[PDB]
Amino acid sequence: PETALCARRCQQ
Amino acid sequence: QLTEEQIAEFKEAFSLFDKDGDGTITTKELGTVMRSLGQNPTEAELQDMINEVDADGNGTIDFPEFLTMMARKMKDTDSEEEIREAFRVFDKDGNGYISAAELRHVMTNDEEVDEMIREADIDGDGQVNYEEFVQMMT
Amino acid sequence: TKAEKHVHNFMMDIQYTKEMKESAARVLQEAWMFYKHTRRKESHAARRHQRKLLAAINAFRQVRLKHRKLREQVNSMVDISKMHMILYDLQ
Amino acid sequence: LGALRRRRALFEKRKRLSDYALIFGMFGIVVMVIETELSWGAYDKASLYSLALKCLISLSTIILLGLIIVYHAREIQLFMVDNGADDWRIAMTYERIFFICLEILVCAIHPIPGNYTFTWTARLAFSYAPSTTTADVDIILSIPMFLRLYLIARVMLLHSKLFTDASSRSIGALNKINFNTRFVMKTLMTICPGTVLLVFSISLWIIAAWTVRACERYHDQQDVTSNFLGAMWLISITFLSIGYGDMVPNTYCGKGVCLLTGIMGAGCTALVVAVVARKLELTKAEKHVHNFMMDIQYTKEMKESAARVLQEAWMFYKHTRRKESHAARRHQRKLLAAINAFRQVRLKHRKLREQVNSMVDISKMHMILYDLQ
Amino acid sequence: LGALRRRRALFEKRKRLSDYALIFGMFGIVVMVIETELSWGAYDKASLYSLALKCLISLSTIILLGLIIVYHAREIQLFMVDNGADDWRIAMTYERIFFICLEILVCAIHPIPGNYTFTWTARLAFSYAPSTTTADVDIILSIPMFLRLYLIARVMLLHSKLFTDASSRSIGALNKINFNTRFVMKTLMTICPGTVLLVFSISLWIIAAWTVRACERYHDQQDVTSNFLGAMWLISITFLSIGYGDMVPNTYCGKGVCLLTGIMGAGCTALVVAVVARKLELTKAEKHVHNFMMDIQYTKEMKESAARVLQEAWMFYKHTRRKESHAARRHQRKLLAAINAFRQVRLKHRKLREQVNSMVDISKMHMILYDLQ
Amino acid sequence: LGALRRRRALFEKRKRLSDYALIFGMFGIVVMVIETELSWGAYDKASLYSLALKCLISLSTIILLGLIIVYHAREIQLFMVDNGADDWRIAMTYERIFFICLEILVCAIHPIPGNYTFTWTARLAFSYAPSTTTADVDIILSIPMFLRLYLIARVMLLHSKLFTDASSRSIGALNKINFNTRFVMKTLMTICPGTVLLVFSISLWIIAAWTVRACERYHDQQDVTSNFLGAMWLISITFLSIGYGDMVPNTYCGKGVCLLTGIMGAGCTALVVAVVARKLELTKAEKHVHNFMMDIQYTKEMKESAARVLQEAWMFYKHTRRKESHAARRHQRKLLAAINAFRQVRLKHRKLREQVNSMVDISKMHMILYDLQ
Ligand SMILES: [Ca+2]
Ligand SMILES: [Ca+2]
Ligand SMILES: [Ca+2]
Ligand SMILES: [Ca+2]
Ligand SMILES: [K+]
Ligand SMILES: [K+]
């Protein structure tokens, strides 16, 4: 994930 | 006797109920105070409620009688008023004397009520009055 | 609605009248039961029937007050209609 | 007079049948919740504890359907009494038959004994990665079982005191009042508006939390929305419309419960606020006491406000006569502020008197009319 | 008369004991906040600076419990004076004893001196990965200490002027009013409704933000929600039901405070709006001034609107007599527009007079009734 | 009469100075927006276009402060005229001096010419990674420049017709009305309640979106919330309290503006709903027309509803006499449904007539009182 939005959502 | 602050505040309340300052609460002053509070009391009810605390029967409430009324009304719940109201609702006919038939009727909502009548009729007049009701309540 | 409130307030008044009859019945029932045990010299029994009498008096006061509040609401809503009747009489 | 005895006998039978329809209706729901929870971990759907627990739901549904049929047989007979008919076919309208079939269809949806499965394919949330499971068919029949709660409303109506009392029927006929199920709802919202909304909110909380958990448990491998407290937190911020978004359902069943809760919680919170704002308002009798005590306070405040007006005016005069420029100016500012303060309290006393004379307007009209009589 | 001296004396002692229970009740809360914030970084839970600060909470709890016990003994003595009873046992009901023990239990939950630990296992948000930490047992006892804020309601009620004043007791007795804690709450929401909701909201903001930070600090290795300005942001977007969802608590403690803020904020914002909407409304004396000036303005507008009707009507005639087709056509479109503008102002003037006559209806009735006298 | 000429002379000077203070107050804000948006792009903070554009803000602040000082000197002179004082020192209270210095402090915050920088360390959102940048000192002095909008309220009050008109002042004195800035606010919310809430919402939209963009641009490299249309989309979903959470500001300046917009939007939408709900209500003159036409419709419905009652009653008799069991049964179901339909329209007509009498109650009272005269 380039941005932290994608890091947080793909983990949840 | 009551302290200075209590006497002062009771005098303030009495003067709130006594506009003319003559020292006695005429029934007109009590009526106009009640009307200023949103109630509409009739003359009959006003006179009935003014002689409850009128000890000497002069027809007006002086300071000692107002003090007695305040001592009765300062507590959150007054037992005398509730006993009087229970006696009123017991007296369907409104004559002031609850007959034995009414005493039996109010319990359906035989020997026990007869025992109550026997033990409450202190003067033996064949019926139960307000004084007998408060004596049995206490 | 304006007509369903009058029906509800009319049936509530009948309910409160019956509640006051049963609440005042308990006031005297516990008052005499207190007198019966007191005359029999039963300290604990009289004490319990004095707690019950005090609770019955408070319960009778509560139903008496809520009945008074209902009568205030009934009179407040029936004010202008009563005014019309008085005005017709003056004619 | 003959129809009065029959009508009362038939009403008692209808009330008794509605009580048994709620006993068996709620029993099947309770056993459904027990069987649903246990069939996940405790045993499997091919066990003898599931054939013996789904035969309790099935048997209760058979008896419940009999009580629904018999209840409507008493309603037909009551129709033939009120409307003075002799043939039951006169009561068979197209609306009554539709509602008879609707109640039967609603009350016949239960987990059938046997191990049946279907392929449930859902796309997860956020990642939107496909997931597939062989979910049982007993999950799409257990959720509709919550529709049997309509028997609660029928029981409340039939058990209502004014629905059958001859005192209320006679008074209601004078005002042309229909004692239908809407009237009971409206009277409940006037007697106990807060208790009805609190009971409904809590009941919807547990039921929606369990429904989301029961649907999400197939497509949840991290016990996130398939946990009871993870679904009771998911459906708590939808009722309040906070919508954090940290947890959302992965399926279209948990998304239909979040949607339903959002609609219900949008209106329930507004109705609760209306009830609360109506219980924090002084009554018409407590407003006369409050205004009476405020009037006494304002009269005493005007006595001390006007006293300061003259006290500072004379202190200004005393220092002016003594030829003290700084002191005279210091007390002239105090005199101006005292006059402004006296004006402020005089205006707020005027406002109170206007408010007092606005709530004793119609009542004063009654007094004048009584005098004219 | 004899019981008036003893009732006033026992009320003064009850009022004095209520003040001291708030002095020690709030002091223990303050020392709890100091010790909670300092035992994190400044020292450790097995220090002599923590055994000496947690013994101040313990010492203040013993004194607070003594003041609660003595206060309730004064209530028993007051009951025996009012009800006329002579034996304290007539006052010991099942409802009074339950509340005596409830206040003792609420006021006895404080951080006990010592170093006791428990294993706190939580699951971080947005990933639901396990996180286990050894947390002190003094964090599950510090949060309940905020339940001592119920003593503020007791102090407010006993210090209320109308609760004991003989002028208000007599006036309230005529209207059969009950001077309880609910009456004080309702009078507060009428006198200063915007000072009660603003103080409550700010106090809740500070208390809830600290409670969230205190719980969300054993399971926060990024200083996200364990920051005080990061806990105030969380509480504020939940109070206003925005719910960004960038920060949610990782523990059930923080999730419980955020759920309590959402419930309070749903109603507090709605109540505040109604306050700001009842203060932006013209009073009954300012509406009459506004309507008086509107009537003068509309009368002047009608004079100038009818002047334009005739001015364009004659301008149309002047050009028509001069045989100018285009000029007459242009002055007839203006005349029709002028007539429409004259109608619009005349209609809005009629609407205003309708409103003026609607407000002055019952007051005009009083004047007629006075004349008939 | 002499002070009447001086009071009107000083009021015209105050109105003239308030207009020029708003001209220069808004000029400094406009140049601030131009210089802020260009320093990021066209030129740098060390250029000759920034020394020449920040000297326009500084020069306009000097003139604006001069007009604020002179305006308050006119209010001091007007005080000495109204209150009949001879020394201005009697007009110098502690509240007036504080407010004079508060306005000067608010109006003196502008970007000083020169290149001063400070280190801005902020923690990004959703990742909480530190980001240190060398921000200019003219970003913490440009945002407070929006506090000069308080001059708009002063200009609206001083330009209001009823604030100075001798016709409105005389009428207001009879009703004891105070013509202050609160009265102007209340009259605006009654004349045009939707225009006031629509201009405020749109103006707040552009001002807050620019403030978010200006603050949240030193810590933005993906052009997400440093974009005007990205900031205008973040603010709108906070005003509506949707709160997607897709974009949240990274700074404390953008986080204090989203909170400010959330508070304002919580009440503005509630006030707007009330306005739109007070305009969809039929007026007292349109309700009488609607009720009159409904009464005509219901009377026509009763004629046709009772016609069907007898039509099916005879159709039942015709087939019964012809000995047609099925045909008679069908016409008895239709007769029963026709009777129920007749009852429903008769009940809804009775309800309308009751509603008509409820509104026409006091007007009927007036006619009776006129007759008694
Ligand atoms: Ca007198
Ligand atoms: Ca006397
Ligand atoms: Ca009798
Ligand atoms: Ca007797
Ligand atoms: K919302
Ligand atoms: K939201």
Author numbering:
A (entry chain I): 6 to 17
B (entry chain F): 4 to 112, 119 to 147
C (entry chain B): 400 to 490
D (entry chain C), E (entry chain D), F (entry chain A): 118 to 490
Copy the relevant paper text.
Small-conductance calcium-activated potassium (KCa2.x, or SK1, 2, and 3) channels are activated by increased intracellular Ca2+ to induce potassium efflux and regulate membrane potential. To enable high-resolution cryo-EM studies of human SK2, we designed a chimera (SK2–4) that contains the transmembrane and extracellular domains of human SK2 and intracellular domains of human SK4. SK2–4/CaM forms a non-domain swapped tetramer with four CaM molecules bound, similar to the previously reported SK4/CaM structure (Lee and MacKinnon, 2018). The CaM C-lobe is constitutively bound to the HA and HB helices, and upon an increase in intracellular Ca2+, the CaM N-lobe binds to a unique S4–S5 linker, inducing a conformational change in the S6 helices to open the potassium pore and activate the channel.
To understand how apamin interacts with the unique conformation of the S3–S4 linker and how that interaction inhibits K+ conduction, we incubated Ca2+-bound SK2–4/CaM with excess apamin prior to cryo-EM grid preparation. The C-terminal helix of apamin binds at the extracellular opening of the pore and interacts with all four S3–S4 linkers of the tetramer. In this position, apamin blocks the exit of K+ ions from the extracellular side of the pore to inhibit conduction. To probe the interaction between SK2 Phe243 and apamin Arg13 and Arg14, we determined the apamin sensitivity of a Phe243Ala mutant and found it to be insensitive to apamin inhibition up to 3 µM, demonstrating the critical role of this interaction for apamin binding and inhibition.
